[PDB]
Amino acid sequence: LPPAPRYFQGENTAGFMRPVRFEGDITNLEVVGEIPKSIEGTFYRVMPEPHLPSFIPNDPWFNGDGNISGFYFKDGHVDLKQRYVRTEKFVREAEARRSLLGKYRNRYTDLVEFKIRSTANGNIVYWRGQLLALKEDSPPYAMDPETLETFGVYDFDGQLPSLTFTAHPKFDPVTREMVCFGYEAKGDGTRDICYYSFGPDGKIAETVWLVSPVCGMIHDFAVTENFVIFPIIPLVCDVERMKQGGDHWQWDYSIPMYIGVLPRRGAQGSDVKWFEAPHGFAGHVANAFEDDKGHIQLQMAYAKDNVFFWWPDANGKGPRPGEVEAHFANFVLDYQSDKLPLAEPTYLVDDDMEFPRIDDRVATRKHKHTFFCIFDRKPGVTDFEFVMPRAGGGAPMSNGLAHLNHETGDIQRYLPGPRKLTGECIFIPRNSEAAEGDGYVMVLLANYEDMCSELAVLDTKDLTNEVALIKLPVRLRPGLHGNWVDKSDVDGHPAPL
Amino acid sequence: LPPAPRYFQGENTAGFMRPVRFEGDITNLEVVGEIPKSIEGTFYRVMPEPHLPSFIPNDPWFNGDGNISGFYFKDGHVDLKQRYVRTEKFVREAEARRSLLGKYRNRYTDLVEFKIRSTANGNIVYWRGQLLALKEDSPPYAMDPETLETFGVYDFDGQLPSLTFTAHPKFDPVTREMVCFGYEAKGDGTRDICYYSFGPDGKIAETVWLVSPVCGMIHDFAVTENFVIFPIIPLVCDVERMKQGGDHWQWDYSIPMYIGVLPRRGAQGSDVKWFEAPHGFAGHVANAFEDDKGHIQLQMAYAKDNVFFWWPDANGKGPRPGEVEAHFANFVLDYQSDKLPLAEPTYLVDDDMEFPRIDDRVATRKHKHTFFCIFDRKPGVTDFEFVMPRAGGGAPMSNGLAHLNHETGDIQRYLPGPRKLTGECIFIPRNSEAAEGDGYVMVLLANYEDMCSELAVLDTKDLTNEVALIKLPVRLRPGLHGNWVDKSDVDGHPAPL
Ligand SMILES: [Cl-]
Ligand SMILES: [Cl-]
Ligand SMILES: [Cl-]
Ligand SMILES: [Cl-]
Ligand SMILES: [Cl-]
Ligand SMILES: [Cl-]
Ligand SMILES: [Fe+2]
Ligand SMILES: [Fe+2]
């Protein structure tokens, strides 16, 4: 077989990106300042973290084994529990004590035949007493919220109609439904999208099969009262390329950013309208809602070139690292309209941004608060001379959070410091009676001075000030998505406003 | 109550001495070089590591909660398992989420009444299918060698005659006995020493009660074929001082270094002879044996002043940090002699040394190989300018290992590098047929450049060369004693030569 390296090599596993690969507990974490005693619940986050050195050189960040962190908060005390998802990949590679799964989303490069290729490293969400560890090429993996034990691959009591489950399901605060989909829903290179939803009782509600114009990456989607929206990243899959050992994804400069709109209830596949936004990269969705006119307001990160530059076009054409900026875009869509081309979006701020969060109590409805990561290149904000040599590569950089008030237009910016970078933030309602976007923000910091991770707790009253700084004595590798599960929420999700 | 700090403060918990307090697993550790495939067994080590910040300012290193590391070796692969001993202290402080036990060995400063005050941080040894986590003020805590689960306080099936069990029991390679003792054997300030042994079947053999001339610290002891030897450190205990909030230990410049010799079998308390070595500090025993003349050769680290300077005499008189050197001393004792004063010892090498190990296959018999820690102050060996600001305080420093051949007088010195310090080494016989001191040496390194720990594997054929360097992505806080449990040894201890 291809030889298995016995230590990590390359930029993707250097400095702060070096895997730690620890599982277990650190209770009673060190705290500078004071954690508000009223905060009770768990911050779950997932990071890609290769358990074994890959036989694939410069294996992308997105292909690392999912490791779940839980920060358990009560009476101003916090404990860390950390455990890898027991994917088929993790278990078989652990047994063999060497890497067996090959290139990102290319089964033809695997050293053994996998049934499930999930790294379960995309997202970690709460649904009906379980954690779901999500990866958009696979079904979810169900886990115990208390122990982080893996129960196994989850098929919703045999109801799961799709081979694939999105990393970005939406939770309706009114209906208590989990609104889902999968792309490549019938296997590698298929244009089949399965749109499906589950009621709070766990019974499947919607199941609509539709066809994508191209086999494009649909990473995120949006849900309104009456519509579901599928923005397609112009990364396109050719299974014949994959069979020769090629990349799953290849940029296509010749296609628009397709935005499919489907009626949310009682629709057929043919009811989908594929609107055509100006060519660009579909980033993460903040939220979507229908205004008084009944028009969809789609608010999402949007770039004008390939953010995933490591997957260029057929002739290897694409941007360089740190060249492409994503901006907080508003797209207006009308399902009634027969005009497929969409106008350029309006931009809500000028910041290079990503990883937008709202108060999920107004998810699928009009929101007036967004929290998002920013990358400010303004001199001095990040000491690049100090950070970059310690940073490694393969992961996006954010050197602050921003809070946008959509009513007033006021922006607050949290800057952790010149030698610190942030992950995706979570929002915690102050209590069940709290106004929209009123409460606490938590965000994991990479401290490049200490080569340690920190968990910052902010009050939305003043986002510039750390109320508490939780000091971890180890590195948590830069990760992807995380979620708050409040103790006062019986189904793990907050009550509607 | 005295307020509980929510983060660690002071030199004893700064830099590399900052508690990590992690429990769990890191499997398939990164390896530079090659671990010999024939090595099969576990390296167990214990470190003091406070689980919660103390309410006692500048709490000594020796008062930290015992955390057990296990390095499990097979076919050139190694896994780390890490778990705290579930002492009464650990469990009750974990329940309270704050420190409750007060000053080192002073129950009158405790915020609650403890039955057992053990931190189980002294040593971790194998006996009859269990680990024993040792602390000289308490009985052992029994643990699972595989899972590091704590079974609880161990009383040897109700046979334990003493309130105290030494951190330095001796394993006779011929008789397969565990030879033990406890000082302060009837509680705080008592001059009672209980000498006791267990046969390989777990039945108690010897139990002799004797009286110490003073209530002095007997940290280590020595066992020969026919004698047991108790060197007393001139640190003396006054319970009346303790009741006023004073130190358990206070140096006494007016007494010799007492060395008690007792017949190993069938003795009474009154059979002990208290010989009087020149005033000095009794360091760790390498080994003792009877020569052809029947005289005891006692080989141990020996200093001329108080190594534990933080416990000075009644008027606060004592040395400064890094001032006192310990030297590899040979004391000659004759149980038959009526002359109590002993001559100054002969010195086997000139090195400032401690933590001596032998091939334990010749324990209690003539040995011709010793491995020990050294601290070379020769300029350039340690980059003090770089290390000291990152080092913290409270723990002894060693910047190399030495192998002494007692026959030839040849010394090999392992220097890990200018920005690395060592812990206590272990010796592993190459195989069951290997000559004395022939095989492998392992030692945990503190790497002050990476602020990470490393486990170095050396061949005794050439101690200057690292055969393998196991790269931990976390710090293991400087610790005390560790032991090898070879897979080929059913009772966990090597066969006699
Ligand atoms: Cl890798
Ligand atoms: Cl599991
Ligand atoms: Cl992160
Ligand atoms: Cl402390
Ligand atoms: Cl336990
Ligand atoms: Cl150590
Ligand atoms: Fe995502
Ligand atoms: Fe010791």
Author numbering:
A (entry chain D), B (entry chain A): 30 to 526
Text lifted from the article:
Carotenoid cleavage dioxygenases (CCDs) are non-heme FeII enzymes that catalyze the oxidative cleavage of alkene bonds in carotenoids, stilbenoids, and related compounds. pmcCarotenoid cleavage dioxygenases (CCDs) are a broadly distributed superfamily of enzymes that catalyze the reaction of dioxygen (O2) with carotenoids, stilbenoids, and related redox-active polyenes. These enzymes use a mononuclear non-heme FeII center to activate O2 for reaction with a specific alkene group in the substrate, generating carbonyl-containing products of importance in biological processes such as hormonal signaling and light detection. Unlike many mononuclear non-heme iron dioxygenases that coordinate their FeII centers using a 2-His, 1-Glu/Asp “facial triad” motif, CCDs use a 4-His cluster, three of which hydrogen bond to second-sphere carboxylates (Glu/Asp). While one coordination position is occupied by a solvent ligand as demonstrated by several crystallographic and spectroscopic investigations, the other is vacant because of apparent occlusion by a nearby methyl group of a semiconserved, second sphere residue (i.e., Thr/Val/Ile), making CCDs five-coordinate (5C) in their resting FeII states.
